[PDB]
């Protein structure tokens, strides 16, 4: 079936934080 790549994440440098952007809040709706 569907086969997936084995990535190489070694080499260079990567951050350890979660890259995030400013987000909005989603309202609650009355039923």
């Amino acid at each position: 079936p569907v086969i997936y790549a084995q990535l190489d994440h070694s080499g260079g440098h990567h951050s350890d934080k979660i890259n995030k952007s400013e987000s909005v809040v989603y309202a609650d709706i009355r039923k």
């Binding site: 997936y4 790549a5 084995q6 990535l7 890259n19 987000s23 909005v24 609650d28």
Partner: protein
């Protein structure tokens, strides 16, 4: 943009990339092998490669590498940073050309990929009381959002599952347009009490 295809497996992704795509075309889609995960499917050298996207609930990554709060941020990063997607023999995987998925509606109140903050800016600058738009959810790939100006901007998640659309588990609709029309005639109201009238669309440009 428009690289996210909600309703497809890797086999269908391969069909789309080999028929409509070129080398460098790519898309994202849900994972079938691990429900909850996502996948990139990328055309390279006349064949398709699939890349697993881990979704921990706090971030997305490629089982390693940089971590991202949203799927769109992961995709954007790997489009913009050449050489960071590589296999063990050194072969680079390049995300060059989004293979576009058709929009769920043709109406001009649908803004496609538009962040929540971008939508708030749009509604505060160009909108009036009761102005509204619909956009893709960034935090829930495959879902949508009704953003309404009332001054504040309110965002209402629209769940999309099995080609049906609903708000908060309420009445379900066969299309985005049907849902919007309904809630124009029957304005929803927040729990805090604010009535979200859909008075006029804020149209794309």
């Amino acid at each position: 943009r428009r690289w996210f295809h909600p309703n497809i497996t890797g086999v269908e992704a391969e069909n789309l990339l080999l028929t409509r795509g070129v080398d460098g075309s790519f898309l994202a889609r849900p994972s079938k092998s691990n429900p909850g995960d996502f996948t990139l499917s990328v055309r390279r050298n006349g064949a398709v490669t699939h890349i697993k996207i881990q979704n921990t609930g706090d971030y997305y990554d490629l089982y390693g590498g940089e971590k991202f709060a949203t799927l769109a941020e992961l995709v954007q990063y790997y489009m913009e940073h050449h050489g960071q997607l590589k296999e063990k023999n050194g072969d680079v995987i390049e995300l060059k050309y989004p293979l576009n998925c058709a929009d769920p509606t043709s109406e001009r109140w649908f803004h496609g990929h538009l962040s929540g903050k971008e939508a708030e800016k749009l509604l505060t600058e160009k909108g009036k009381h009761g102005s509204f738009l619909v956009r893709e959810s960034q935090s829930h790939p495959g879902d949508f959002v009704l953003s309404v100006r009332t001054s504040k901007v309110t965002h209402v998640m629209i769940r999309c599952q099995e080609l049906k659309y609903d708000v908060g588990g309420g009445e379900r609709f066969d299309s985005l347009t049907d849902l919007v029309e309904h809630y124009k005639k029957n304005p929803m109201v927040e729990t805090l009490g604010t009535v979200l009238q859909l008075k006029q669309p804020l149209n794309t440009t």
